[PDB]
UniProtKB/Swiss-Prot annotation, chains A, B:
Keywords: Antibiotic resistance, DNA-binding, Magnesium, Metal-binding, Plasmid, Repressor, Transcription, Transcription regulation. Tetracycline binds at H63, N81. Residues 25-44 bind DNA. GO terms for molecular function: DNA-binding transcription factor activity; metal ion binding; transcription cis-regulatory region binding. Mg(2+) binds at H99. The gene is tetR. Pfam families: TetR_C_1, TetR_N. Homodimer. This is Tetracycline repressor protein class D. TetR is the repressor of the tetracycline resistance element; its N-terminal region forms a helix-turn-helix structure and binds DNA. Binding of tetracycline to TetR reduces the repressor affinity for the tetracycline resistance gene (tetA) promoter operator sites. Residues 2-62 form the HTH tetR-type domain. Induction: By the [Mg-tetracycline]+ complex.
Length: 207, 207
């Protein structure tokens, strides 16, 4: 099949959804594409370059809320931003493991820059705007990794069904796995944003 | 060398610090221990059982603040808890990648149970206590993964040194990598806790 950037990325994401990150290799990618490894090598040097590119593309394709709406509050933008980040990461198997250790790509510079200018225009210093952005990303990444990687681990070996857990831990785990972890996440996200709001409004006051 | 649980775990953590999670194998563990693979297999069935055990042991050894102090506020306990969780995860290379997708171990039941009882005795429902605990873990895990995995990625290929970044993104990344990410983390952690505090005190009031 065809080996332009787009087709290589499409085949790569298919294979990622078939086999997960740890068994995504240039060997199996070559196989999926019906080509010899030294053909693929012309197009994709290594698994790292491949992972770097999927990270960027999963967002370009599926992270629809990168930009604030005209007039949107910074709280609403961080919420809508986080929800969209979470969506994009969950869309492919081990997606958050793919995102891990990427930095914004040149094709995301203007997007990430705008996001920081927007914060700073709402009364954040660069530094608190940065911390808010970073906290939202790290929170959202952990929440999606815990969920994806809890799941991957269960494929490999089960858990004790209850007949062994102490009572609170027993009902806590029933609750946290009764949706995908979406309510733990949406609740944590409100706590985080209100925390940034309390910090920002305080200004020089001891808070 | 000796193959009791303790010695296998010690050798495993050494190898983890030498080679990272992705090149930690039962082959190289057998080599490190100076034994044949079918000898190791008696002791350790697979990489999963091995990862499950290192996850538990890295905490037992190095997560000193699992328990609140008598009289300690829930805010102070979540802070001291998170800081200690972060420490334990950073102590070994790809440590957070090791923790990912573990659930509390039987030898951590009484610890995690106590943590939930403590929250609920401070006025959290099980559910908000749970969300607070989960948010603190997911935040702390993302923060440590972003840092560890940003680092692992740099071994594999560098970044653009500045002569290409737009201005805010340029100075943001200088700031966020001028310590290990410890100030982004400690700031995010205060925002999260104050957010849980605002939620809890509100009770039935629209907040
Ligand atoms: C400059 N800024 C503080 C940093 C620092 C370190 C980082 O590792 C990153 C950023 C920007 C953030 C912005 C976030 C943004 N959001 C908070 C989720 C975001 O929506 C995007 C995006 N491309 O739309 C990211 O690049 C992003 O996911 C991302 O991957 C980032 C990222 O990796
Ligand atoms: C029951 N509780 C809500 C859950 C649910 C899902 C989970 O995946 C987990 C917990 C408890 C938390 C407690 C946290 C605690 N802390 C908030 C960091 C903690 O200090 C410990 C500990 N063993 O001391 C954990 O087990 C812990 O790191 C952990 O790994 C957990 C964990 O994995
Ligand atoms: Cl074709
Ligand atoms: Cl082609
Ligand atoms: Cl193309
Ligand atoms: Cl490869
Ligand atoms: Cl293969
Ligand atoms: Cl986890
Ligand atoms: Cl010996
Ligand atoms: Cl022995
Ligand atoms: Cl032992
Ligand atoms: Cl193995
Ligand atoms: Cl090997
Ligand atoms: Cl990251
Ligand atoms: Mg990122
Ligand atoms: Mg855990």
């Amino acid at each position: 099949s065809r080996l332009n950037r787009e087709s290589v990325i499409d085949a790569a994401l298919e294979l990622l959804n078939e086999t997960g990150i740890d068994g995504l290799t240039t060997r199996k990618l070559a196989q999926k594409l019906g080509i010899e490894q030294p053909t693929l090598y012309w197009h994709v040097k290594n698994k790292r370059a491949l992972l770097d590119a999927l990270a960027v593309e999963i967002l370009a394709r599926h992270h629809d809320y990168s930009l604030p709406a005209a007039g949107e509050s910074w709280q609403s933008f961080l919420r809508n931003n986080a929800m969209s980040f979470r969506r994009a990461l969950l869309r492919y198997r081990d997606g958050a493991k793919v995102h891990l250790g990427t930095r914004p790509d040149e094709k995301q510079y203007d997007t990430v820059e705008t996001q920081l200018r927007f914060m700073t225009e709402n009364g954040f210093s660069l530094r608190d705007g940065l911390y808010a952005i970073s906290a939202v990303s790290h929170f959202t990444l952990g929440a999606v990794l815990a969920q994806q990687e809890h799941t991957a681990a269960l494929t490999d070996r089960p858990a004790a069904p209850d007949e062994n857990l102490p009572p609170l831990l027993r009902e806590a785990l029933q609750i946290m796995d009764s949706d995908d972890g979406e309510q733990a996440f949406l609740h944590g996200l409100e706590s985080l944003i209100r925390g940034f709001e309390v910090q920002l409004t305080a200004l020089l006051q001891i808070v």
